[PDB]
Amino acid sequence: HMKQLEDKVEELLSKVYHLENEVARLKKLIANKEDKADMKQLEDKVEELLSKVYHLENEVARLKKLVG
Amino acid sequence: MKQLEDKVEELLSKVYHLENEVARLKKLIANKEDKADMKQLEDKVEELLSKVYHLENEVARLKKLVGER
Amino acid sequence: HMKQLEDKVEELLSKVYHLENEVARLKKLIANKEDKADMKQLEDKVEELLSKVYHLENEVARLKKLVG
């Protein structure tokens, strides 16, 4: 019985060792993923571009009328 | 001895839970945006900023030439 | 025999505590990373901008010629 329990503890130690290795790998993977906190600057640039392009399109339509 | 047994029982439970949790986290990580992909998106946007700046300058000049406010 | 088993149970308790803490931390870190599914609207805007800007460039070239 004592042997059997010691064997179970050894098996669990081995499982925990494997999980530690897996967690180490996941830490590396997550470090190469984009943070939500870094999204906003890009989002703002895109929103500004959309506004600027809308204005340009409106101006170009007006110029086409006048030139033609 | 039974105390030791009960301790291993509770540790066993914790380990099974951690196995499940780590499996779930592995899946969540796979669904996240890569920094490398973000960088390429940022590069496109930087090019767009330059092109739009130029267009704005060209359109301002055209407006002047046709007498448009 | 008993002393050895206790030392391994103690070892396992400590390693599990360590693993639990780092998994809890990883969970929160992962939650702060951007999901690919939440990128699609931004990606579509950038694609739309590429097209709109290319079109504007062609229109503006044509206007510059016609205006003189």
Residue numbers in the entry:
A (entry chain B), C (entry chain A): 0 to 67
B (entry chain C): 1 to 69
Give verbatim lines from the article.
α-Helical coiled coils are ubiquitous protein domains, found in a wide range of structural and functional contexts. The structure of coiled coils is understood at a level unrivaled by any other fold. They consist of at least two α-helices, wound into superhelical bundles and held together by a mostly hydrophobic core. The seven positions in a heptad are labeled a – g, where positions a and d are oriented towards the core of the bundle and are thus mostly hydrophobic. We find that they indeed break the α-helices to form short β-strands, which associate into a triangular supersecondary structure we name the β-layer. β-Layers are found, also repetitively, in natural coiled coils, where they form regular fibers with alternating α- and β-structure, a protein fold that has not been described so far.
The observation that the T9 construct could accommodate the MATKDDIAN insert in two ways, forming the β-layer either at MAT or at KDD, led us to wonder whether the same could happen with the A9 insert, IENKADKAD, if the glutamate was interchanged with the central alanine to mirror the first six residues of the T9 insert (A9b, IANKEDKAD). We reasoned that the larger glutamate residue at the center of A9b might even be sufficiently unfavorable to move this construct quantitatively to the alternative structure, with the β-layer formed over the first three residues (IAN). A9b in fact crystallized in two alternative structures, but in both the β-layer formed over the central glutamate. Since this residue was indeed too large and polar to be accommodated without distortion, the first turns of the downstream helices are perturbed to different extents in both instances, leading to a pronounced kink in one of the structures (highlighted in pink in Figure 3A). We were surprised to see that the penalty introduced by the central glutamate was not sufficient to produce the alternative structure; the reasons for this are unclear to us at present.
